[PDB]
Write a protein that holds these residues in place. Structure first.
Motif, PDB file in Angstrom:
ATOM      1  N   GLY A 175       0.877  -1.261   0.047  1.00  0.00           N
ATOM      2  CA  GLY A 175       0.091   0.084   0.117  1.00  0.00           C
ATOM      3  C   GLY A 175       0.848   1.275  -0.008  1.00  0.00           C
ATOM      4  O   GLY A 175       2.162   1.092   0.104  1.00  0.00           O
ATOM      5  N   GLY A 176       0.201   2.375  -0.031  1.00  0.00           N
ATOM      6  CA  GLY A 176       0.907   3.746  -0.221  1.00  0.00           C
ATOM      7  C   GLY A 176       0.119   4.413  -1.122  1.00  0.00           C
ATOM      8  O   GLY A 176      -0.424   3.853  -2.442  1.00  0.00           O
ATOM      9  N   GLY A 177       0.703   5.941  -1.188  1.00  0.00           N
ATOM     10  CA  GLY A 177       0.169   6.803  -2.416  1.00  0.00           C
ATOM     11  C   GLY A 177      -1.087   7.005  -2.164  1.00  0.00           C
ATOM     12  O   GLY A 177      -1.841   6.920  -0.983  1.00  0.00           O
ATOM     13  N   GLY A 178      -1.993   7.611  -3.155  1.00  0.00           N
ATOM     14  CA  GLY A 178      -3.183   8.085  -3.253  1.00  0.00           C
ATOM     15  C   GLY A 178      -3.522   9.664  -2.951  1.00  0.00           C
ATOM     16  O   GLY A 178      -2.289  10.004  -3.386  1.00  0.00           O
ATOM     17  N   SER A 179      -4.671  10.069  -3.230  1.00  0.00           N
ATOM     18  CA  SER A 179      -4.940  11.560  -3.159  1.00  0.00           C
ATOM     19  C   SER A 179      -4.934  11.882  -1.588  1.00  0.00           C
ATOM     20  O   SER A 179      -4.876  11.087  -0.477  1.00  0.00           O
ATOM     21  CB  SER A 179      -6.390  11.585  -3.696  1.00  0.00           C
ATOM     22  N   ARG A 180      -5.460  13.434  -1.482  1.00  0.00           N
ATOM     23  CA  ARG A 180      -4.994  14.026  -0.237  1.00  0.00           C
ATOM     24  C   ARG A 180      -5.904  13.565   0.853  1.00  0.00           C
ATOM     25  O   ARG A 180      -7.069  13.219   0.867  1.00  0.00           O
ATOM     26  CB  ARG A 180      -5.558  15.366  -0.384  1.00  0.00           C
ATOM     27  N   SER A 181      -4.921  13.093   2.043  1.00  0.00           N
ATOM     28  CA  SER A 181      -5.449  12.393   3.298  1.00  0.00           C
ATOM     29  C   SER A 181      -6.158  11.105   3.150  1.00  0.00           C
ATOM     30  O   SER A 181      -7.174  10.964   3.690  1.00  0.00           O
ATOM     31  CB  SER A 181      -6.611  13.532   3.904  1.00  0.00           C
ATOM     32  N   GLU A 182      -5.513  10.277   2.345  1.00  0.00           N
ATOM     33  CA  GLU A 182      -6.168   9.011   1.943  1.00  0.00           C
ATOM     34  C   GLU A 182      -4.935   8.110   2.672  1.00  0.00           C
ATOM     35  O   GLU A 182      -3.771   8.165   2.574  1.00  0.00           O
ATOM     36  CB  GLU A 182      -6.346   8.632   0.585  1.00  0.00           C
ATOM     37  N   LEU A 183      -5.253   6.938   2.871  1.00  0.00           N
ATOM     38  CA  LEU A 183      -4.430   5.772   3.214  1.00  0.00           C
ATOM     39  C   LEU A 183      -4.692   4.517   2.368  1.00  0.00           C
ATOM     40  O   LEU A 183      -6.126   4.300   2.245  1.00  0.00           O
ATOM     41  CB  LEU A 183      -4.449   5.180   4.555  1.00  0.00           C
ATOM     42  N   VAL A 184      -3.796   4.087   1.446  1.00  0.00           N
ATOM     43  CA  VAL A 184      -4.319   2.963   0.501  1.00  0.00           C
ATOM     44  C   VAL A 184      -3.656   1.975   0.792  1.00  0.00           C
ATOM     45  O   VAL A 184      -2.509   1.593   1.015  1.00  0.00           O
ATOM     46  CB  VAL A 184      -3.860   3.709  -0.936  1.00  0.00           C
ATOM     47  N   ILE A 185      -4.311   0.683   0.747  1.00  0.00           N
ATOM     48  CA  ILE A 185      -3.979  -0.620   1.295  1.00  0.00           C
ATOM     49  C   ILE A 185      -4.275  -1.686   0.115  1.00  0.00           C
ATOM     50  O   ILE A 185      -5.271  -1.539  -0.666  1.00  0.00           O
ATOM     51  CB  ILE A 185      -4.444  -1.121   2.542  1.00  0.00           C
ATOM     52  N   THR A 186      -3.445  -2.473  -0.237  1.00  0.00           N
ATOM     53  CA  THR A 186      -3.529  -3.366  -1.253  1.00  0.00           C
ATOM     54  C   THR A 186      -3.054  -4.624  -0.972  1.00  0.00           C
ATOM     55  O   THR A 186      -2.354  -4.950   0.076  1.00  0.00           O
ATOM     56  CB  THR A 186      -2.848  -2.899  -2.616  1.00  0.00           C
ATOM     57  N   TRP A 187      -3.710  -5.816  -1.552  1.00  0.00           N
ATOM     58  CA  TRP A 187      -3.258  -7.161  -1.456  1.00  0.00           C
ATOM     59  C   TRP A 187      -3.867  -7.932  -2.842  1.00  0.00           C
ATOM     60  O   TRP A 187      -4.385  -7.502  -3.625  1.00  0.00           O
ATOM     61  CB  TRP A 187      -4.258  -7.668  -0.172  1.00  0.00           C
ATOM     62  N   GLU A 188      -3.089  -9.043  -2.778  1.00  0.00           N
ATOM     63  CA  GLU A 188      -3.570  -9.982  -3.614  1.00  0.00           C
ATOM     64  C   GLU A 188      -5.215 -10.684  -3.536  1.00  0.00           C
ATOM     65  O   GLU A 188      -5.194 -11.283  -2.408  1.00  0.00           O
ATOM     66  CB  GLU A 188      -2.654 -11.137  -3.929  1.00  0.00           C
ATOM     67  N   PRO A 189      -6.191 -10.625  -4.437  1.00  0.00           N
ATOM     68  CA  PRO A 189      -7.411 -11.212  -4.060  1.00  0.00           C
ATOM     69  C   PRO A 189      -7.047 -12.820  -3.699  1.00  0.00           C
ATOM     70  O   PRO A 189      -6.193 -13.538  -4.454  1.00  0.00           O
ATOM     71  CB  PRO A 189      -8.265 -10.925  -5.293  1.00  0.00           C
TER      72      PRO A 189
END
Length: 305
Positions: free
Chosen positions: A115-129
């Motif tokens: 995760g990481g990045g994104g737009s203002r005041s966001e927290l972006v989390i990712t994973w493999e389905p």
């Protein structure tokens, strides 16, 4: 003798979360005694018939029943049985009526969490389905847990889409590029699976707030221009400037149709190539990070050749 005929009447005697006990009727042995039975399975998630493991590990010619093991919970299975003798292996039986294994809670954790990045005041989390055959029951979804570094209370977001691979948390109290502890688990109608290991993810950045200064351009030839500028002061590993974005367009062209060259790193110089001779170009420079570009420099103009 010749290879055996197909066994008949494959029947699911019992089915659990990971096993299925089958029975069958022997077909003709064609004058060579049957020495082994082998079982194959088919599911909606894989192509074709596949070998399966059994108890007993080898199904002898005098066995008309066996238990298939290491099946996945809440999966629809077809089974079929092949007979062998000393001469060869016969044609497979007709398949059993489809049967679904019993369900359980998820066992795996979602892989490759980041995760990481994104737009203002966001927290972006990712994973493999999680693949369908490892979901273990209906109603499958993800539990995404996170907390700002240095706090105790967790926040949990549920993502009820089995196909999803991202969760975006938006809240205005997240300062830019702030560290969070994150862990991701699965759930389904039967209960919750385990969380994976905790990792550190940074929230989204904020665009640089300063324009670069001292933008200068020098014509090197009919087609090349040397562009230089002064780096933004006081950038840090927390308030980052990753590089600069140069935009350049010919005189009497619209700024919207500009070409774009980006630098990465600290060198505040770049050569723009491929230009037309005796032609005037407008140029600006902006800093950027992963949130986007900051305010531009004033426009500098240069005539080639």
């Amino acid at each position: 003798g010749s290879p055996p005929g197909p066994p008949t009447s494959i029947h699911v005697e019992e089915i659990t979360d990971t096993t299925a006990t089958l029975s069958w009727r022997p077909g003709p042995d064609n004058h060579s005694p049957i020495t082994a039975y082998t079982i194959q399975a088919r599911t909606p998630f894989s192509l074709g018939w596949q070998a399966v493991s059994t108890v007993p590990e080898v199904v002898g010619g005098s066995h008309l029943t066996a238990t298939v093991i290491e099946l996945n919970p809440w999966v629809e299975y077809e089974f079929r049985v092949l007979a062998s003798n000393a001469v060869g292996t016969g044609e497979p039986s007709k398949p059993s009526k489809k049967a679904r294994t019993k369900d359980t809670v998820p066992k795996v954790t979602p892989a490759n969490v980041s995760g990481g990045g994104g737009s203002r005041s966001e927290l972006v989390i990712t994973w493999e389905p999680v693949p369908e055959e490892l979901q273990n029951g209906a109603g499958f979804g993800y539990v995404v847990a996170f907390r700002p570094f240095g706090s105790t209370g967790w926040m949990q977001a549920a993502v009820p889409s089995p196909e999803a691979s991202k969760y975006v948390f938006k809240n205005e109290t997240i300062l830019p590029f702030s560290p969070f502890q994150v862990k991701v688990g699965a759930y389904n109608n039967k209960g919750e699976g385990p969380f994976g290991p905790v990792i550190t993810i940074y929230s989204a950045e904020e665009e640089p707030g300063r324009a670069p200064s001292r933008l200068r351009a020098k014509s090197l030839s009919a087609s090349d221009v040397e562009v230089s500028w002064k780096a933004l002061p006081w950038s840090t590993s927390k308030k980052r400037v990753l590089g600069y974005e140069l935009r350049y367009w010919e005189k009497n062209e619209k700024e919207d149709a500009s070409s774009v060259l980006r630098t990465v790193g600290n060198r505040t110089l770049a050569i723009i190539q491929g230009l037309k001779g005796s032609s005037t170009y407008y140029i600006t420079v902006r800093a950027y990070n992963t949130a986007g570009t900051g305010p531009p420099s004033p426009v500098v103009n240069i005539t080639t050749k």
